[PDB]
Enzyme design. Structure first.
Site, short mmCIF file in Angstrom:
data_model
loop_
_atom_site.label_atom_id
_atom_site.label_comp_id
_atom_site.label_asym_id
_atom_site.label_seq_id
_atom_site.Cartn_x
_atom_site.Cartn_y
_atom_site.Cartn_z
N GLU A 31 -0.91 -4.94 13.74
CA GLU A 31 0.10 -5.85 14.26
C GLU A 31 -0.36 -6.56 15.53
OE1 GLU A 31 4.43 -5.12 13.98
OE2 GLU A 31 4.30 -4.65 16.12
N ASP A 58 5.30 -3.87 3.91
CA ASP A 58 5.27 -2.41 3.92
C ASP A 58 6.12 -1.94 2.74
OD1 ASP A 58 3.72 -2.21 6.25
OD2 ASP A 58 5.49 -2.28 7.54
N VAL A 59 5.78 -0.77 2.19
CA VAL A 59 6.48 -0.23 1.03
C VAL A 59 7.76 0.55 1.32
CG1 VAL A 59 5.23 1.94 0.97
CG2 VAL A 59 6.18 1.00 -1.15
N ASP A 60 7.87 1.14 2.50
CA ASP A 60 9.06 1.91 2.84
C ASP A 60 10.18 0.99 3.29
OD1 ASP A 60 7.25 1.42 4.98
OD2 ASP A 60 8.24 2.92 6.24
N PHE A 87 0.87 -1.16 0.00
CA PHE A 87 0.00 0.00 0.00
C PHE A 87 0.92 1.21 0.00
CE2 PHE A 87 -4.26 -1.76 0.95
CZ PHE A 87 -3.89 -3.09 1.09
N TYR A 107 4.00 8.02 0.88
CA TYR A 107 4.64 6.71 0.72
C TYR A 107 4.85 6.25 -0.72
CZ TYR A 107 4.29 6.04 5.76
OH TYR A 107 4.43 6.17 7.12
N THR A 132 5.22 -6.59 23.17
CA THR A 132 4.26 -5.49 23.21
C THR A 132 2.89 -5.87 22.66
OG1 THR A 132 5.07 -4.61 21.09
CG2 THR A 132 6.06 -3.73 23.11
N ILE A 177 0.12 5.13 0.04
CA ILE A 177 -0.75 6.30 0.06
C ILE A 177 0.02 7.55 0.46
CG2 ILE A 177 -2.58 7.41 1.40
CD1 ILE A 177 -2.50 3.77 0.12
C1 LIG Z 1 13.96 -3.25 22.46
C2 LIG Z 1 14.00 -2.23 21.33
C3 LIG Z 1 13.10 -2.37 20.22
C4 LIG Z 1 13.41 -1.62 18.82
C5 LIG Z 1 12.29 -1.79 17.71
C6 LIG Z 1 10.95 -1.07 17.98
O1 LIG Z 1 10.24 -1.43 16.76
C7 LIG Z 1 8.87 -1.04 16.79
O2 LIG Z 1 8.13 -2.06 17.46
C8 LIG Z 1 6.72 -1.75 17.57
C9 LIG Z 1 6.07 -2.84 18.41
O3 LIG Z 1 6.53 -2.80 19.75
C10 LIG Z 1 6.11 -1.61 16.18
O4 LIG Z 1 6.24 -2.84 15.48
C11 LIG Z 1 6.85 -0.51 15.42
C12 LIG Z 1 8.34 -0.85 15.36
O5 LIG Z 1 9.06 0.22 14.70
C13 LIG Z 1 9.21 0.11 13.32
O6 LIG Z 1 10.07 -1.00 13.03
C14 LIG Z 1 11.39 -0.87 13.62
C15 LIG Z 1 12.14 -2.15 13.32
C16 LIG Z 1 12.09 0.37 13.07
O7 LIG Z 1 12.35 0.21 11.69
C17 LIG Z 1 11.23 1.62 13.30
O8 LIG Z 1 11.83 2.73 12.64
C18 LIG Z 1 9.81 1.41 12.76
O9 LIG Z 1 9.00 2.51 13.12
O1 LIG Z 2 0.08 5.69 11.62
C1 LIG Z 2 0.45 4.88 10.76
C2 LIG Z 2 1.80 4.64 10.35
C3 LIG Z 2 2.02 3.59 9.27
N1 LIG Z 2 0.95 2.89 8.68
C4 LIG Z 2 1.18 1.86 7.62
O2 LIG Z 2 2.42 1.18 7.89
C5 LIG Z 2 3.24 1.09 6.70
C6 LIG Z 2 4.72 1.21 7.08
O3 LIG Z 2 4.83 1.64 8.43
P1 LIG Z 2 5.62 2.80 9.15
O4 LIG Z 2 5.28 4.08 8.47
O5 LIG Z 2 5.28 2.72 10.62
O6 LIG Z 2 7.09 2.31 8.75
P2 LIG Z 2 7.99 1.06 9.17
O7 LIG Z 2 7.54 0.80 10.56
O8 LIG Z 2 7.55 -0.12 8.15
O9 LIG Z 2 9.44 1.24 8.89
C7 LIG Z 2 2.78 2.22 5.80
O10 LIG Z 2 2.87 1.83 4.43
C8 LIG Z 2 1.28 2.39 6.17
O11 LIG Z 2 0.42 1.67 5.31
C9 LIG Z 2 -0.36 3.14 9.11
O12 LIG Z 2 -1.34 2.55 8.63
N2 LIG Z 2 -0.54 4.11 10.10
#
Ligand SMILES: CCCCCCO[C@@H]1O[C@H](CO)[C@H](O)C[C@H]1O[C@@H]1O[C@@H](C)[C@@H](O)[C@@H](O)[C@@H]1O
Ligand SMILES: O=c1ccn([C@@H]2O[C@H](COP(=O)(O)OP(=O)(O)O)[C@@H](O)[C@H]2O)c(=O)[nH]1
Ligand SMILES: [Hg+2]
Ligand SMILES: [Hg+2]
Ligand SMILES: [Hg+2]
Ligand SMILES: [Hg+2]
EC number: 2.4.1.40
Length: 263
Positions: free
Chosen positions: A221, A129-131, A59, A64, A163, A61
């Site tokens: 998630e 995810d696309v990013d 996705f 992104y 979590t 949007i």
């Molecule tokens: C113990 C330290 C943990 C470090 C990773 C935290 O990752 C984040 O986890 C939450 C769930 O608890 C959710 O899945 C978002 C996730 O963050 C994203 O993914 C991580 C791997 C990084 O790429 C972040 O930049 C993202 O926002």
């Molecule tokens: O508030 C948010 C943030 C992210 N996304 C979705 O999560 C994907 C990737 O997530 P994020 O921006 O958190 O980046 P990442 O965690 O994968 O590095 C995006 O393409 C969106 O579709 C969403 O639905 N709501």
């Protein structure tokens, strides 16, 4: 159902583990995919003889859409190379999708924002995810009826630290003494049938929560984790499949970083 052809490869020693630093099989006997656990030549043969088609959904949007070029370009170099691939890009900006050159047997569909078409066009669906960008091989070793991916930030944590959603009022609730692993909402898949069941279940669960005025701590998630707790995945992918090197470095247990977050 056709038989594999003659193949030459080293014998696997029964009295020698393939990896002595990680768990390679879950308690319900689903393999945990790490580099070294599979012979890609054998797996490629099995899936090619089946004329397997893999659908990859993303996705994109708003802002992104800017990640599509790198995502698709790297997917062409590392995702299911040699097999039939169908990319499905759901976006609110059809005209903004970059024109990426695709190898033979691979196609792209742009959907502006019909489950029946999936069942008719692909055998497996991979949702990510696309990013992100592919940096190494991501092939048929991941294909199975249903798979989840070990979150890179929690594969070494105790379950109490996971979590998960902890409020009993939420449909995604998981108590402190339950849980196998903490899976990523950003990388799951399996057969079209199993994937649609998962997304359908999660959609219904989120609506129930919405009606009850509650939103799971990690949204999609959180529900995916509840679904996979109650419906064990037939394969589990190691963190090699979704990593963030800037945040987590490159641990010894990771022989390859296949799919990663973009800095
Ligand atoms: C113990 C330290 C943990 C470090 C990773 C935290 O990752 C984040 O986890 C939450 C769930 O608890 C959710 O899945 C978002 C996730 O963050 C994203 O993914 C991580 C791997 C990084 O790429 C972040 O930049 C993202 O926002
Ligand atoms: O508030 C948010 C943030 C992210 N996304 C979705 O999560 C994907 C990737 O997530 P994020 O921006 O958190 O980046 P990442 O965690 O994968 O590095 C995006 O393409 C969106 O579709 C969403 O639905 N709501
Ligand atoms: Hg999907
Ligand atoms: Hg769910
Ligand atoms: Hg959902
Ligand atoms: Hg889900």
């Amino acid at each position: 159902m056709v038989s594999l052809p003659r193949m030459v490869y080293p014998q696997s020693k029964v009295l020698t583990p393939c990896r002595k630093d990680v768990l390679v099989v879950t308690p319900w006997l689903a393999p945990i995919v790490w580099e070294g656990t599979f012979n890609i030549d054998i797996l490629n043969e099995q899936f090619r003889l089946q004329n397997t088609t893999i659908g990859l959904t993303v996705f994109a949007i708003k802002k992104y859409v800017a990640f599509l070029k790198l995502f698709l370009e790297t997917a062409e170099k590392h995702f299911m190379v040699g097999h039939r691939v169908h990319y499905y890009v759901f976006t609110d900006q059809p005209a903004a999708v970059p024109r990426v050159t695709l190898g033979t047997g691979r196609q792209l569909s742009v959907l502006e924002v019909c489950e029946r078409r999936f069942l008719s066009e692909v055998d497996y669906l991979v949702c990510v995810d696309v990013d992100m960008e592919f940096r190494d091989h991501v092939g048929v070793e991941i294909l199975t009826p249903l798979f989840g991916t070990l979150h890179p930030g929690f594969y070494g944590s105790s379950r109490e630290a996971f979590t998960y959603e902890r409020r009993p009022q939420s449909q995604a609730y998981i108590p402190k003494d339950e849980g196998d692993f903490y899976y990523l909402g950003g990388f799951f898949g399996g057969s079209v049938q199993e994937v649609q069941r998962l997304t359908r279940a999660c959609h219904q669960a989120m609506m129930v929560d919405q009606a009850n005025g509650i939103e799971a701590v990690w949204h999609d998630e959180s529900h995916l984790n509840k679904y996979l707790l109650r419906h064990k995945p037939t394969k589990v992918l190691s963190p090699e499949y979704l990593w963030d090197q800037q945040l987590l470095g490159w641990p010894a247990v990771l022989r390859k970083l296949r799919f990663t977050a973009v800095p």
